[PDB]
Amino acid sequence: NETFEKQLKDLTSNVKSIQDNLLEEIITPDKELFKKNVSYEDIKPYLDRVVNGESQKMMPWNNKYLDNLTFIYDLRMQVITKHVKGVEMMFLFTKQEPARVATSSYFKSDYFKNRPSNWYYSYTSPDEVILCPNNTESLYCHLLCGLVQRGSIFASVMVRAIEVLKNSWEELCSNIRSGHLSNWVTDLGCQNSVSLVLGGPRPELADTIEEICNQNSWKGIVKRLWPNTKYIETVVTGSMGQYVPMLNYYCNDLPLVSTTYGSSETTFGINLDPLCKPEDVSYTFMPNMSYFEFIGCTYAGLYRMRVGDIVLVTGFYNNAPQFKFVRRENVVLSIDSDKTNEEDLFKAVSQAKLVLESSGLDLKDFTSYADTSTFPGHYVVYLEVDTKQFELDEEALSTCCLVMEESLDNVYKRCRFKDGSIGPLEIRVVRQGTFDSLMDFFISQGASTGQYKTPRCIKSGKALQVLETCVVAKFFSI
């Protein structure tokens, strides 16, 4: 609207002045002297000092979601309201926690309950289902309410949300008839609210659902159940890019839209161009939460903190700069004097999936592990493949083994070829739904549901045998 456009204009130019005002509002409870004056691994001795007892520098936690997330949600609501019409069922999760937790700090906060409710903040899933500590029951509640409906934080969850429906349909069909939530749903909120949603039986929808679901092709399925949905909202940037092409098969190729970029430290900014395809999607940063200041180059509670993620400038309106996410620092694979990171992995798997694509297969998911047990220590990748023992092509993936190697840095290839520090790259083929079972492992181990993204390197190593157990075959380079 006029007000939204006006505000968006007021955010320009935010480069220095407004960011310095926010910096002053921060500091008080000039900027040159601060710059001449002013990581969590570094802050760990300093940050853990305030946790010294339970059952104090600053006041935890008024930061972030209070003054940040609601603003973002509303503004992006108005953005998609501007770029899309007719919009005037999302998957989010909370688990049992006095500590900062995921986006669940928002769901546990009164900014969520006192949230303005119009459309964007209105959902088909009962709010009791959202906060439900049982995410397995609450997911089924989301999918049942959806089955009756007439995106998420991360993309990695979305496919799983598609996965469950693949293994379960008719149970929902019996549930809508019974008017009761499934007997194995133990949550009071889920049970009650969902039973209320079901209410009277609806065989009319049940039969046509049964007719629609049985189709032999999974191509573009999710778009059929709710055609009126214009767009998907999930992060397709970063590692989550891995999940892009799979959706387009499962969907009608409706737009995949990444609205926001933020970390545990704070929320950074939002994407101002919904017209951006997943690869060019760019996050422009907000001045109010801004620190580290600002300006085609490579680059409250926290002052001059180092974020720990890598971004590049995708361009600008010249009023404010735009940024696309590339890689994250923390994840790295190494043997001797060789650092291989997220974007090198993505490079290699991009080189690899083009080989699989020619053989009549594809790649559902991947992750990595380095084996230091035996010399030479070699790079190991775990692949889960889909056809759109049984059907094994020795050549395709043994080609995929090599095609990843020369895609990586010559550093690796120095320790690989000539000097023998590392041996031939190994690919492990895992059976169906292995990565599904693997994410089930993490959640139960104290990992957020539901904040979930698939790690591309495994240090655990308690999760390692889970992939090992499911390996169908192994293939090597050279």
Ligand X SMILES: Nc1ncnc2c1ncn2[C@@H]1O[C@H](COP(=O)(O)CP(=O)(O)OP(=O)(O)O)[C@@H](O)[C@H]1O
264 binds, among Mn ion, ligand X, none (CB under 5 to 8 A by kind): ligand X
Residue 39 binds ligand X, judged by CB under 6 A: no
Stretch of 252-260, 274-282, 326-334, 455-463 contacting Mn ion, by CB under 5 A: 326-334
In this structure, the number of other CB atoms found within 10 A of the CB of residue 370 comes to 17
* Residue of 309, 343, 406, 440 interacting with ligand X (CB under 6 A): 309
Residue 273 binds ligand X, judged by CB under 6 A: no
Residue 235 binds ligand X, judged by CB under 6 A: yes
Cβ at position 160, least distance to ligand X in Å: 17
Q: How many residues bind Mn ion (CB under 5 A)?
A: 1
Chain residue whose CB lies nearest ligand X: 238
Stretch of 292-300, 323-331, 383-391, 463-471 contacting Mn ion, by CB under 5 A: 323-331
Q: CB–CB of 107/130 below 8 Å?
A: yes
Enumerate residues 6+ apart whose C-beta is below 8 A from 321.
Answer: 284, 285, 294, 295, 313, 315
- CA distance linking residue 474 with residue 429, whole number of Å: 6
Q: CB–CB of 199/288 below 8 Å?
A: no
Bridge partner residues of 430 (DSSP): 471
* Residue of 39, 263, 410, 432 interacting with ligand X (CB under 6 A): 263
* Residue of 112, 325, 346, 452 interacting with ligand X (CB under 6 A): 325
* Residue of 95, 115, 324, 328 interacting with ligand X (CB under 6 A): 328
Contact map string, positions 90 to 119, toward Mn ion, x by CB under 5 A: ------------------------------
Ligand-binding annotation for 75, yes or no, is yes
Contact map string, positions 87 to 126, toward ligand X, x by CB under 6 A: ----------------------------------------
| Nearest to ligand X of 237, 407 (CB atom) | 237
- CA distance linking residue 331 with residue 393, whole number of Å: 31
In this structure, the number of other CB atoms found within 10 A of the CB of residue 277 comes to 11
Q: How many CA atoms lie within 13 A of 477 on its CB side?
A: 20
* Residue of 261, 323, 346, 366 interacting with ligand X (CB under 6 A): 261
Rg (CA), the chain: 24
Q: CB–CB of 427/135 below 8 Å?
A: no
Residue 450 binds ligand X, judged by CB under 6 A: no
Ligand-binding annotation for 237, yes or no, is yes
* Residue of 220, 308, 376, 377 interacting with ligand X (CB under 6 A): 308
CB-count burial class (<10 Å; 0-12, 13-18, 19+) for 290: buried
Bridge partner residues of 312 (DSSP): 298, 324
Residue 328 binds Mn ion, judged by CB under 5 A: yes
Ligand-binding annotation for 74, yes or no, is yes
| Nearest to ligand X of 190, 463 (CB atom) | 463
Read off the tokens for 87.
Answer: 């919009």
Q: How far is CA 42 from CA 50, 329, 366, 413, in A?
A: 15, 16, 32, 33
Ligand-binding annotation for 46, yes or no, is no
Enumerate residues 6+ apart whose C-beta is below 8 A from 174.
Answer: none
Bridge partner residues of 323 (DSSP): 313
Cβ at position 412, least distance to ligand X in Å: 22
Cis peptide before 450 (omega within 30 of 0): yes
Query: Residue 153's closest CA among 244, 247, 232?
Result: 232
Q: CB–CB of 276/282 below 8 Å?
A: yes
| Nearest to ligand X of 62, 330 (CB atom) | 330
319 binds, among Mn ion, ligand X, none (CB under 5 to 8 A by kind): none
| Nearest to ligand X of 179, 245 (CB atom) | 245
Ligand-binding annotation for 264, yes or no, is yes
134 binds, among Mn ion, ligand X, none (CB under 5 to 8 A by kind): none
Look up residue 456 and give its amino acid: R
Q: CB–CB of 340/409 below 8 Å?
A: yes
Q: How many CA atoms lie within 13 A of 136 on its CB side?
A: 12
Cβ at position 415, least distance to ligand X in Å: 25
Residue 238 binds ligand X, judged by CB under 6 A: yes
The runs of H, that is alpha helices, within 226-341 are 244-250
Residue 237 binds ligand X, judged by CB under 6 A: yes
Summarize the annotated binding site for AMP as residue ranges. 237, 260, 264, 283, 309, 328
Residues that bind ligand X (CB under 6 A): 235, 237-238, 258, 261, 263-264, 308-309, 325, 328, 330, 453
Annotated binding site: 73-76, 237, 260, 264, 283, 309, 328
Q: Given the rule CB under 5 A, which residues bind Mn ion?
A: 328
